[PDB]
Design an enzyme around this catalytic site. Structure first.
Site, mmCIF file in Angstrom:
data_model
loop_
_atom_site.group_PDB
_atom_site.id
_atom_site.type_symbol
_atom_site.label_atom_id
_atom_site.label_comp_id
_atom_site.label_asym_id
_atom_site.label_seq_id
_atom_site.Cartn_x
_atom_site.Cartn_y
_atom_site.Cartn_z
ATOM 1 N N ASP A 35 0.835 -1.199 0.000
ATOM 2 C CA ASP A 35 0.000 0.000 0.000
ATOM 3 C C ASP A 35 0.873 1.253 0.000
ATOM 4 O O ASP A 35 1.344 1.682 1.060
ATOM 5 C CB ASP A 35 -0.907 -0.003 1.219
ATOM 6 C CG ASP A 35 -1.813 1.205 1.269
ATOM 7 O OD1 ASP A 35 -1.900 1.914 0.242
ATOM 8 O OD2 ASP A 35 -2.435 1.436 2.337
ATOM 9 N N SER A 199 -0.532 15.534 -12.109
ATOM 10 C CA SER A 199 -0.747 15.148 -13.492
ATOM 11 C C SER A 199 -0.986 16.402 -14.326
ATOM 12 O O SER A 199 -1.521 17.402 -13.844
ATOM 13 C CB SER A 199 -1.952 14.203 -13.578
ATOM 14 O OG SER A 199 -2.331 13.948 -14.916
#
Length: 330
Positions: A35, A199
């Site tokens: 994770d 992004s």
């Protein structure tokens, strides 16, 4: 040193991925959910409330000659999906894919929430976010990666998650045969303890690319892709019959649909998520309403590049002095 381990989807939907981890002496092998959005290595154990164990493999520290109770240490964690666990702490030897850390904090669960009990395939979590998020008190503990870093050939790990197929976590090296083209690296902020990056925009299907900054986290422990409501609405508007359902808890779409791809930007590079990766199947057994793999982050407070996005790429988690992320197509 290096390590390399295969990671395998827990079910036919790729709801999560499990990677075998050796703990203790002699080794006890548990299948852990790696994770990158959390920083605790915790396991079902001989200390876990018996009614809360249902099929998981447990760690038994009393059978490990290298286990030592970390005196006074406790841990307690709550995840973004509402699940939680807590317990006490041992140090022990932990190996992943041939890479060994001695003295790793292994957090032994005394209590787990129902969603953990109900998932017999996940024996615990191995956190790979920054150690500043580790919940052990009163002395915060380091992640497996942080402990291994100095020994690694290169201070990196890579995530290569498969679509409906096994993949690989590598530590300490970049397998140049595992991706196409070049790896595009992008800046990371560690201020929230995550692999947080920005992004450069998105496209839906064959549509034109929209240049827009989207700050979010690379999170292998989250199944889906959570993005701003504007972006998600633009995606699902291209699917006939798709709608946001408050009763189901997100966007659903007719199971008869063919989904468009979704592209996200990494600098000037582009990662394409095929439409099929966005199908999470019937909302309930036998339903013709299917659950979408791209959902709104509006209620979360952060955008999350979960498995839906990450499994379309070869992803480098660069733990150099200034961390960065790398993405390549594959």
């Amino acid at each position: 040193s290096t390590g390399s381990a295969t990671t395998t989807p827990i079910d036919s939907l790729d709801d999560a991925y499990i990677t075998p981890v050796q703990i203790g002496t002699p080794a006890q092998t548990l299948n852990l959910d790696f994770d990158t959005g959390s920083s605790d290595l915790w396991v079902f154990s001989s200390e876990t409330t018996a009614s809360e164990v249902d099929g998981q493999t447990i760690y038994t520290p009393s059978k490990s000659t290298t286990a030592k109770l970390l005196s006074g240490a406790t841990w307690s964690i709550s995840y973004g999906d509402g699940s939680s666990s807590s317990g006490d702490v041992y140090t022990d030897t932990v190996s992943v894919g041939g890479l060994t850390v001695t003295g790793q904090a292994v957090e032994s669960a005394k209590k787990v929430s129902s969603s953990f009990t109900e998932d017999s395939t996940i024996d615990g979590l191995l956190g790979l976010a920054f150690s500043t998020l580790n919940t052990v008190s009163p002395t915060q503990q380091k992640t497996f990666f942080d402990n291994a870093k100095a020994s690694l050939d290169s201070p990196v790990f890579t995530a290569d998650l498969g679509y409906h197929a096994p993949g690989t976590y590598n530590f300490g090296f970049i397998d140049t045969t595992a991706y196409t083209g070049s790896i595009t690296y992008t800046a990371v902020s560690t201020k929230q303890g995550f692999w947080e990056w920005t992004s450069t925009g998105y496209a839906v299907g064959s549509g034109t690319f929209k240049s827009t900054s989207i700050d979010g986290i690379a999170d292998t422990g989250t199944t889906l892709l959570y993005l701003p409501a504007t972006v998600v609405s633009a995606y699902w508007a291209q699917v006939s019959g798709a709608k946001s359902s408050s009763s189901v808890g997100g966007y659903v779409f007719p199971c008869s649909a063919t989904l468009p791809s979704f592209t996200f930007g990494v600098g000037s590079a582009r990662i394409v998520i095929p439409g099929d990766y966005i199908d999470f199947g019937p909302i309930s057994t036998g339903s013709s309403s299917c659950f979408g793999g791209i959902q709104s982050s509006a209620g979360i407070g952060i955008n999350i590049f979960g498995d839906v996005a990450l499994k379309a790429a070869f992803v480098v988690f660069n733990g150099a002095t200034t961390p960065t992320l790398g993405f390549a197509s594959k």
